[model samples]
Target: GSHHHHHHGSMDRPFIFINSAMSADGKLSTKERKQVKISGKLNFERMDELRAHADAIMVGIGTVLADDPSLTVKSPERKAARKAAGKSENPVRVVVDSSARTPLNADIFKKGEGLRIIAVSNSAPEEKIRMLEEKALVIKTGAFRVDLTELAAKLKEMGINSLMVEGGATLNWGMLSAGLVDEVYTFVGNLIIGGKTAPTFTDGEGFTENELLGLELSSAEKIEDGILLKWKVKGKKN
Candidate 1:
Protein backbone atom coordinates (compact mmCIF):
# COMPACT_ATOMS: atom_id res chain seq x y z
CA GLY A 1 0.00 0.00 0.00
CA SER A 2 2.28 2.75 -1.20
CA HIS A 3 0.82 6.20 -0.38
CA HIS A 4 3.20 7.99 -2.67
CA HIS A 5 0.98 10.44 -4.61
CA HIS A 6 3.15 12.25 -7.09
CA HIS A 7 2.59 15.99 -7.32
CA HIS A 8 0.74 17.37 -10.35
CA GLY A 9 2.77 20.56 -9.92
CA SER A 10 5.76 18.74 -11.30
CA MET A 11 8.66 20.95 -12.50
CA ASP A 12 7.50 23.88 -10.42
CA ARG A 13 9.46 25.00 -7.33
CA PRO A 14 7.78 23.44 -4.36
CA PHE A 15 6.02 26.11 -2.35
CA ILE A 16 7.81 26.13 1.02
CA PHE A 17 6.32 27.40 4.26
CA ILE A 18 7.98 27.50 7.68
CA ASN A 19 6.09 27.22 10.95
CA SER A 20 7.66 28.10 14.34
CA ALA A 21 6.40 28.73 17.84
CA MET A 22 8.75 30.92 19.79
CA SER A 23 8.56 32.68 23.15
CA ALA A 24 7.46 36.27 23.52
CA ASP A 25 11.13 37.09 23.74
CA GLY A 26 11.82 35.33 20.42
CA LYS A 27 13.62 32.24 21.71
CA LEU A 28 12.89 28.83 20.20
CA SER A 29 14.50 26.98 23.10
CA THR A 30 16.93 27.20 25.99
CA LYS A 31 20.68 27.71 25.64
CA GLU A 32 21.28 23.96 25.53
CA ARG A 33 18.92 23.61 22.54
CA LYS A 34 16.39 21.81 24.72
CA GLN A 35 12.78 21.24 23.73
CA VAL A 36 10.25 23.54 25.38
CA LYS A 37 6.56 23.88 24.77
CA ILE A 38 6.09 27.46 23.63
CA SER A 39 2.83 27.19 21.69
CA GLY A 40 -0.60 26.52 23.16
CA LYS A 41 -2.35 23.16 23.11
CA LEU A 42 -4.97 24.67 20.83
CA ASN A 43 -2.20 25.50 18.39
CA PHE A 44 -1.83 21.80 17.71
CA GLU A 45 -5.19 22.04 15.97
CA ARG A 46 -3.81 24.74 13.76
CA MET A 47 -0.61 22.76 13.07
CA ASP A 48 -2.60 19.69 12.16
CA GLU A 49 -4.72 21.71 9.79
CA LEU A 50 -1.62 23.08 8.11
CA ARG A 51 -0.21 19.59 7.71
CA ALA A 52 -3.33 18.55 5.85
CA HIS A 53 -2.65 21.11 3.16
CA ALA A 54 1.03 20.45 2.72
CA ASP A 55 2.47 17.66 0.60
CA ALA A 56 5.30 17.03 3.08
CA ILE A 57 6.63 18.12 6.45
CA MET A 58 10.36 18.72 7.06
CA VAL A 59 12.75 19.21 9.94
CA GLY A 60 16.47 19.44 10.67
CA ILE A 61 18.82 17.02 12.41
CA GLY A 62 18.90 19.18 15.52
CA THR A 63 15.10 19.13 15.74
CA VAL A 64 14.97 15.38 15.06
CA LEU A 65 17.42 14.72 17.92
CA ALA A 66 15.68 17.11 20.29
CA ASP A 67 11.88 16.91 19.96
CA ASP A 68 11.28 13.57 18.21
CA PRO A 69 7.73 14.59 17.28
CA SER A 70 5.66 11.92 15.54
CA LEU A 71 5.05 14.53 12.80
CA THR A 72 1.94 12.69 11.64
CA VAL A 73 -1.43 14.25 11.14
CA LYS A 74 -3.18 13.05 14.30
CA SER A 75 -6.77 13.56 13.25
CA PRO A 76 -8.64 11.17 10.98
CA GLU A 77 -10.98 14.06 10.28
CA ARG A 78 -8.04 16.01 8.97
CA LYS A 79 -6.87 13.08 6.88
CA ALA A 80 -10.31 12.65 5.36
CA ALA A 81 -10.47 16.37 4.73
CA ARG A 82 -7.14 16.24 2.89
CA LYS A 83 -8.18 13.24 0.87
CA ALA A 84 -11.38 15.02 -0.08
CA ALA A 85 -9.21 17.82 -1.34
CA GLY A 86 -7.22 15.27 -3.42
CA LYS A 87 -4.17 14.89 -1.16
CA SER A 88 -2.67 11.92 0.62
CA GLU A 89 -3.82 10.81 4.03
CA ASN A 90 -0.63 11.95 5.71
CA PRO A 91 2.12 14.26 4.58
CA VAL A 92 5.51 12.65 4.00
CA ARG A 93 8.05 13.37 6.74
CA VAL A 94 11.32 14.79 5.44
CA VAL A 95 14.52 15.12 7.47
CA VAL A 96 17.68 16.98 6.58
CA ASP A 97 20.39 14.65 7.84
CA SER A 98 23.62 15.71 6.21
CA SER A 99 25.79 12.82 7.36
CA ALA A 100 23.10 10.08 7.47
CA ARG A 101 23.52 9.76 11.24
CA THR A 102 19.87 9.08 12.06
CA PRO A 103 19.47 6.27 14.59
CA LEU A 104 17.41 3.23 13.60
CA ASN A 105 15.53 3.36 16.89
CA ALA A 106 14.49 6.95 16.33
CA ASP A 107 10.80 7.63 16.87
CA ILE A 108 10.56 8.46 13.17
CA PHE A 109 10.82 4.72 12.48
CA LYS A 110 7.70 3.77 14.43
CA LYS A 111 6.37 0.36 13.37
CA GLY A 112 3.82 0.44 10.53
CA GLU A 113 3.78 4.24 10.61
CA GLY A 114 5.48 7.19 8.93
CA LEU A 115 6.80 7.63 5.40
CA ARG A 116 10.14 9.31 6.15
CA ILE A 117 12.41 10.95 3.59
CA ILE A 118 16.01 11.66 4.53
CA ALA A 119 17.98 14.24 2.54
CA VAL A 120 21.67 13.54 2.98
CA SER A 121 24.84 14.99 1.55
CA ASN A 122 26.35 13.37 -1.52
CA SER A 123 29.39 12.56 0.56
CA ALA A 124 27.44 10.61 3.18
CA PRO A 125 28.94 7.23 4.03
CA GLU A 126 27.42 4.33 2.10
CA GLU A 127 27.19 2.07 5.13
CA LYS A 128 25.30 4.66 7.16
CA ILE A 129 23.13 5.67 4.22
CA ARG A 130 22.19 2.03 3.61
CA MET A 131 21.22 1.69 7.24
CA LEU A 132 18.87 4.70 6.95
CA GLU A 133 17.36 3.31 3.75
CA GLU A 134 15.88 0.57 5.90
CA LYS A 135 13.36 3.01 7.34
CA ALA A 136 13.34 6.00 4.99
CA LEU A 137 13.83 7.13 1.40
CA VAL A 138 17.40 8.37 1.35
CA ILE A 139 17.97 11.16 -1.19
CA LYS A 140 21.58 12.09 -1.89
CA THR A 141 21.88 15.74 -2.87
CA GLY A 142 24.44 18.53 -2.55
CA ALA A 143 28.15 18.08 -1.90
CA PHE A 144 29.01 19.54 1.51
CA ARG A 145 25.51 19.69 2.88
CA VAL A 146 21.98 18.86 1.71
CA ASP A 147 21.31 21.34 -1.08
CA LEU A 148 18.01 22.97 -0.26
CA THR A 149 17.49 24.14 -3.86
CA GLU A 150 18.30 20.79 -5.40
CA LEU A 151 16.26 19.07 -2.74
CA ALA A 152 13.19 21.18 -3.60
CA ALA A 153 13.53 20.40 -7.31
CA LYS A 154 13.80 16.68 -6.65
CA LEU A 155 10.93 16.70 -4.21
CA LYS A 156 8.87 18.56 -6.81
CA GLU A 157 9.74 15.87 -9.34
CA MET A 158 8.39 13.33 -6.85
CA GLY A 159 5.07 15.26 -6.59
CA ILE A 160 5.61 17.20 -3.38
CA ASN A 161 4.48 20.67 -4.36
CA SER A 162 4.09 22.21 -0.93
CA LEU A 163 6.40 21.87 2.07
CA MET A 164 5.82 22.53 5.76
CA VAL A 165 9.08 23.20 7.60
CA GLU A 166 9.25 22.74 11.35
CA GLY A 167 12.67 23.83 12.40
CA GLY A 168 15.64 23.95 14.80
CA ALA A 169 17.37 27.26 13.93
CA THR A 170 20.09 25.94 11.60
CA LEU A 171 17.63 24.52 9.10
CA ASN A 172 15.43 27.57 9.50
CA TRP A 173 18.26 29.88 8.55
CA GLY A 174 19.56 27.52 5.92
CA MET A 175 16.28 27.34 4.02
CA LEU A 176 15.49 31.05 4.24
CA SER A 177 19.07 32.03 3.47
CA ALA A 178 19.01 29.78 0.45
CA GLY A 179 15.82 31.61 -0.73
CA LEU A 180 13.72 28.46 -0.56
CA VAL A 181 11.01 29.68 1.78
CA ASP A 182 7.90 31.38 0.46
CA GLU A 183 6.04 32.08 3.68
CA VAL A 184 6.88 32.03 7.39
CA TYR A 185 4.31 31.73 10.13
CA THR A 186 5.51 32.76 13.58
CA PHE A 187 3.48 32.00 16.68
CA VAL A 188 4.61 33.92 19.75
CA GLY A 189 3.27 32.55 23.00
CA ASN A 190 2.92 34.45 26.26
CA LEU A 191 5.78 32.63 27.99
CA ILE A 192 9.08 34.46 27.80
CA ILE A 193 12.44 32.73 28.13
CA GLY A 194 15.63 34.53 27.25
CA GLY A 195 19.35 33.83 27.52
CA LYS A 196 22.29 35.07 25.51
CA THR A 197 22.88 31.56 24.21
CA ALA A 198 19.23 30.79 23.51
CA PRO A 199 18.21 29.97 19.95
CA THR A 200 15.75 32.08 17.98
CA PHE A 201 13.50 31.21 15.06
CA THR A 202 16.44 31.73 12.70
CA ASP A 203 20.03 31.59 14.01
CA GLY A 204 22.80 30.67 11.64
CA GLU A 205 25.40 33.39 11.21
CA GLY A 206 25.75 37.11 11.48
CA PHE A 207 24.73 38.64 8.23
CA THR A 208 26.26 42.02 7.43
CA GLU A 209 23.99 45.05 7.65
CA ASN A 210 23.44 44.98 3.93
CA GLU A 211 22.71 41.27 3.96
CA LEU A 212 19.89 41.28 6.49
CA LEU A 213 17.00 39.04 5.52
CA GLY A 214 13.78 40.94 4.95
CA LEU A 215 10.26 39.67 5.55
CA GLU A 216 7.06 41.46 4.67
CA LEU A 217 4.29 41.14 7.17
CA SER A 218 1.31 39.69 5.35
CA SER A 219 -1.12 38.82 8.13
CA ALA A 220 -1.15 39.51 11.87
CA GLU A 221 -3.76 38.12 14.21
CA LYS A 222 -4.30 36.28 17.46
CA ILE A 223 -5.01 32.60 18.00
CA GLU A 224 -5.63 30.98 21.34
CA ASP A 225 -3.34 32.42 24.04
CA GLY A 226 -0.81 33.59 21.48
CA ILE A 227 -0.39 35.64 18.31
CA LEU A 228 -0.07 34.05 14.87
CA LEU A 229 1.74 36.17 12.31
CA LYS A 230 2.53 35.28 8.71
CA TRP A 231 5.24 36.85 6.62
CA LYS A 232 6.57 36.57 3.09
CA VAL A 233 10.24 36.78 2.21
CA LYS A 234 10.70 40.21 0.63
CA GLY A 235 13.20 39.46 -2.10
CA LYS A 236 14.61 36.40 -3.85
CA LYS A 237 11.03 35.21 -4.02
CA ASN A 238 10.33 31.51 -3.74
Candidate 2:
Protein backbone atom coordinates (compact mmCIF):
# COMPACT_ATOMS: atom_id res chain seq x y z
CA GLY A 1 0.00 0.00 0.00
CA SER A 2 1.21 3.49 -0.78
CA HIS A 3 0.84 6.52 1.46
CA HIS A 4 0.22 9.11 -1.26
CA HIS A 5 -1.24 11.88 0.82
CA HIS A 6 0.44 14.13 3.31
CA HIS A 7 -1.26 14.25 6.69
CA HIS A 8 -0.69 17.01 9.14
CA GLY A 9 1.12 16.10 12.32
CA SER A 10 -0.37 16.85 15.70
CA MET A 11 -0.37 20.48 16.72
CA ASP A 12 2.60 20.03 18.99
CA ARG A 13 4.46 17.19 17.37
CA PRO A 14 5.17 15.36 14.14
CA PHE A 15 2.93 12.54 12.91
CA ILE A 16 5.17 9.62 13.77
CA PHE A 17 4.83 6.20 12.19
CA ILE A 18 6.94 3.17 13.05
CA ASN A 19 8.12 0.75 10.36
CA SER A 20 9.68 -2.64 10.89
CA ALA A 21 10.28 -6.07 9.43
CA MET A 22 10.06 -8.88 11.93
CA SER A 23 10.12 -12.63 11.88
CA ALA A 24 7.00 -14.72 12.37
CA ASP A 25 7.89 -15.20 16.00
CA GLY A 26 8.23 -11.39 16.39
CA LYS A 27 11.96 -10.95 16.73
CA LEU A 28 13.31 -7.77 15.20
CA SER A 29 16.85 -9.07 15.06
CA THR A 30 19.04 -11.93 16.15
CA LYS A 31 19.87 -12.36 19.82
CA GLU A 32 23.29 -10.89 19.15
CA ARG A 33 21.59 -7.63 18.12
CA LYS A 34 22.65 -8.15 14.51
CA GLN A 35 20.65 -7.16 11.46
CA VAL A 36 18.47 -9.76 9.79
CA LYS A 37 16.92 -9.69 6.34
CA ILE A 38 13.28 -10.36 7.06
CA SER A 39 11.67 -8.84 4.00
CA GLY A 40 12.14 -9.44 0.26
CA LYS A 41 12.72 -7.22 -2.75
CA LEU A 42 9.16 -5.97 -3.17
CA ASN A 43 8.94 -5.07 0.48
CA PHE A 44 12.25 -3.21 0.26
CA GLU A 45 10.78 -1.08 -2.52
CA ARG A 46 7.77 -0.36 -0.33
CA MET A 47 10.10 0.72 2.44
CA ASP A 48 11.97 2.98 0.04
CA GLU A 49 8.69 4.68 -0.79
CA LEU A 50 7.98 5.19 2.87
CA ARG A 51 11.42 6.71 3.34
CA ALA A 52 10.99 9.07 0.40
CA HIS A 53 7.71 10.40 1.74
CA ALA A 54 8.74 11.04 5.31
CA ASP A 55 10.11 14.40 6.45
CA ALA A 56 12.60 12.63 8.68
CA ILE A 57 13.65 9.09 9.57
CA MET A 58 14.77 8.08 13.07
CA VAL A 59 16.42 5.22 14.91
CA GLY A 60 17.89 4.41 18.29
CA ILE A 61 21.51 4.35 19.29
CA GLY A 62 21.17 0.60 19.56
CA THR A 63 20.27 0.43 15.89
CA VAL A 64 22.99 2.86 14.94
CA LEU A 65 25.65 0.75 16.59
CA ALA A 66 24.26 -2.60 15.53
CA ASP A 67 23.07 -2.09 11.95
CA ASP A 68 24.88 1.08 10.94
CA PRO A 69 22.19 1.80 8.32
CA SER A 70 22.55 4.84 6.10
CA LEU A 71 18.79 5.55 6.38
CA THR A 72 18.60 7.23 2.96
CA VAL A 73 16.06 7.01 0.18
CA LYS A 74 17.35 4.31 -2.12
CA SER A 75 15.73 5.20 -5.43
CA PRO A 76 17.38 7.78 -7.61
CA GLU A 77 14.00 8.53 -9.17
CA ARG A 78 12.61 9.22 -5.72
CA LYS A 79 15.52 11.49 -4.94
CA ALA A 80 15.02 13.38 -8.18
CA ALA A 81 11.30 13.64 -7.55
CA ARG A 82 11.87 14.97 -4.07
CA LYS A 83 14.33 17.51 -5.43
CA ALA A 84 11.82 18.47 -8.11
CA ALA A 85 9.32 19.15 -5.38
CA GLY A 86 11.77 21.56 -3.72
CA LYS A 87 12.73 19.16 -0.96
CA SER A 88 16.15 17.83 -0.11
CA GLU A 89 17.45 14.84 -2.05
CA ASN A 90 16.97 12.80 1.06
CA PRO A 91 14.86 13.33 4.14
CA VAL A 92 16.58 14.48 7.27
CA ARG A 93 18.18 11.60 9.14
CA VAL A 94 18.01 11.47 12.93
CA VAL A 95 19.36 9.28 15.70
CA VAL A 96 18.04 9.11 19.25
CA ASP A 97 21.21 8.80 21.28
CA SER A 98 20.60 9.76 24.87
CA SER A 99 24.20 9.35 25.85
CA ALA A 100 25.50 10.79 22.57
CA ARG A 101 26.90 7.40 21.74
CA THR A 102 26.40 7.52 17.98
CA PRO A 103 29.75 7.06 16.31
CA LEU A 104 31.10 10.14 14.57
CA ASN A 105 31.63 8.14 11.39
CA ALA A 106 28.19 6.54 11.39
CA ASP A 107 26.79 5.89 7.90
CA ILE A 108 23.97 8.41 8.36
CA PHE A 109 26.52 11.20 8.38
CA LYS A 110 28.50 9.83 5.44
CA LYS A 111 25.81 8.74 2.98
CA GLY A 112 22.82 11.08 3.03
CA GLU A 113 22.63 14.49 1.37
CA GLY A 114 20.50 16.37 3.87
CA LEU A 115 20.43 17.53 7.45
CA ARG A 116 21.36 15.10 10.20
CA ILE A 117 20.23 15.44 13.79
CA ILE A 118 21.36 13.76 16.96
CA ALA A 119 18.90 13.94 19.84
CA VAL A 120 20.62 13.67 23.18
CA SER A 121 19.85 14.11 26.84
CA ASN A 122 21.02 17.27 28.54
CA SER A 123 23.06 15.18 30.92
CA ALA A 124 24.93 13.41 28.15
CA PRO A 125 28.64 14.08 28.42
CA GLU A 126 29.43 17.47 26.90
CA GLU A 127 32.51 16.16 25.16
CA LYS A 128 30.52 13.57 23.22
CA ILE A 129 27.75 16.03 22.38
CA ARG A 130 30.28 18.50 21.14
CA MET A 131 31.88 15.84 18.98
CA LEU A 132 28.52 14.86 17.47
CA GLU A 133 27.68 18.50 16.88
CA GLU A 134 30.62 18.64 14.53
CA LYS A 135 28.74 16.38 12.11
CA ALA A 136 25.04 16.90 12.92
CA LEU A 137 22.57 19.16 14.67
CA VAL A 138 22.52 18.28 18.35
CA ILE A 139 19.20 18.78 20.08
CA LYS A 140 19.47 18.48 23.85
CA THR A 141 16.41 17.40 25.79
CA GLY A 142 15.42 15.36 28.84
CA ALA A 143 17.60 14.94 31.91
CA PHE A 144 19.19 11.51 31.61
CA ARG A 145 17.44 10.10 28.57
CA VAL A 146 16.30 11.66 25.33
CA ASP A 147 12.69 12.73 25.96
CA LEU A 148 10.63 11.45 23.03
CA THR A 149 7.78 13.89 23.64
CA GLU A 150 10.03 16.92 23.83
CA LEU A 151 12.07 15.69 20.88
CA ALA A 152 8.91 15.28 18.82
CA ALA A 153 7.83 18.81 19.67
CA LYS A 154 11.23 20.20 18.80
CA LEU A 155 11.26 18.28 15.51
CA LYS A 156 7.90 19.79 14.64
CA GLU A 157 9.29 23.23 15.37
CA MET A 158 12.02 22.50 12.85
CA GLY A 159 9.43 21.73 10.10
CA ILE A 160 9.67 17.99 10.37
CA ASN A 161 5.93 17.30 10.29
CA SER A 162 6.16 13.61 9.39
CA LEU A 163 8.58 11.36 11.23
CA MET A 164 9.32 7.77 10.27
CA VAL A 165 10.65 5.63 13.10
CA GLU A 166 12.71 2.63 11.96
CA GLY A 167 13.38 1.03 15.25
CA GLY A 168 15.50 -1.64 16.81
CA ALA A 169 12.92 -2.27 19.58
CA THR A 170 13.99 -0.04 22.46
CA LEU A 171 13.29 3.20 20.67
CA ASN A 172 9.99 1.79 19.49
CA TRP A 173 9.08 1.15 23.10
CA GLY A 174 10.00 4.62 24.16
CA MET A 175 8.14 6.35 21.31
CA LEU A 176 4.99 4.24 21.57
CA SER A 177 4.91 4.34 25.35
CA ALA A 178 5.25 8.10 25.29
CA GLY A 179 2.26 8.28 22.92
CA LEU A 180 4.43 9.71 20.18
CA VAL A 181 3.61 7.14 17.51
CA ASP A 182 0.54 7.74 15.36
CA GLU A 183 0.65 4.58 13.27
CA VAL A 184 2.64 1.40 12.73
CA TYR A 185 3.55 -0.73 9.72
CA THR A 186 4.98 -4.15 10.18
CA PHE A 187 6.01 -6.70 7.57
CA VAL A 188 5.82 -10.14 9.13
CA GLY A 189 8.18 -12.29 7.19
CA ASN A 190 8.16 -16.09 7.16
CA LEU A 191 10.68 -17.58 9.60
CA ILE A 192 11.30 -17.67 13.30
CA ILE A 193 14.46 -16.37 14.86
CA GLY A 194 13.77 -17.45 18.38
CA GLY A 195 15.82 -16.37 21.37
CA LYS A 196 14.84 -15.29 24.85
CA THR A 197 16.97 -12.18 24.67
CA ALA A 198 16.09 -11.26 21.07
CA PRO A 199 14.44 -7.89 20.53
CA THR A 200 10.79 -7.72 19.48
CA PHE A 201 8.85 -4.97 17.73
CA THR A 202 8.15 -3.38 21.10
CA ASP A 203 10.45 -4.19 23.96
CA GLY A 204 10.97 -2.16 27.08
CA GLU A 205 9.57 -2.73 30.50
CA GLY A 206 6.59 -4.70 29.17
CA PHE A 207 3.29 -2.82 29.27
CA THR A 208 0.85 -3.86 31.94
CA GLU A 209 -2.61 -5.11 31.02
CA ASN A 210 -4.32 -1.84 31.79
CA GLU A 211 -1.67 0.18 30.01
CA LEU A 212 -1.49 -1.82 26.79
CA LEU A 213 -1.69 0.34 23.71
CA GLY A 214 -4.67 -0.24 21.43
CA LEU A 215 -4.48 -0.20 17.65
CA GLU A 216 -6.96 -0.09 14.79
CA LEU A 217 -5.93 -2.08 11.75
CA SER A 218 -6.11 0.09 8.67
CA SER A 219 -4.89 -2.36 6.05
CA ALA A 220 -3.24 -5.70 5.48
CA GLU A 221 -1.60 -6.75 2.25
CA LYS A 222 0.47 -9.60 0.99
CA ILE A 223 3.73 -8.28 -0.37
CA GLU A 224 6.81 -10.19 -1.42
CA ASP A 225 7.29 -13.18 0.86
CA GLY A 226 5.61 -11.46 3.82
CA ILE A 227 2.40 -9.87 5.03
CA LEU A 228 2.32 -6.16 5.71
CA LEU A 229 0.02 -4.92 8.44
CA LYS A 230 -0.76 -1.27 8.93
CA TRP A 231 -2.33 -0.09 12.15
CA LYS A 232 -3.48 3.21 13.53
CA VAL A 233 -2.65 3.60 17.19
CA LYS A 234 -5.85 4.29 19.07
CA GLY A 235 -6.65 7.67 20.69
CA LYS A 236 -4.63 9.79 18.28
CA LYS A 237 -6.44 12.73 16.66
CA ASN A 238 -6.31 12.60 12.86
Please provide TM-scores, in order, for all candidate models, with all chains considered together: 0.90, 0.95
Q: What lDDT tens digits, residue by residue, belong to model 1 across residues 1-238? A: 1111223454656888899999999899998888788877788789888987888999998887887777788888988787788766788889999998777887777832546899999889999999999888999999979998889888888878888998878999998777677788999998988998898988888566766667788898898889999987775322
The candidate that wins on lDDT is 2
Deviation from native of the Cα of residue 151 in model 2, angstroms: 0.3
Q: Candidate 1: list runs displaced more than 4 Å.
A: 1-10, 83-86, 111-114, 236-238
* TM-score of predicted structure 2: 0.95
- Model 1 TM-score is 0.90
Identify the candidate with maximal TM-score.
Answer: 2
Off by over 4 Å in 2: 1-6, 236-238
Candidate 1 residue pairs that clash: 7-159
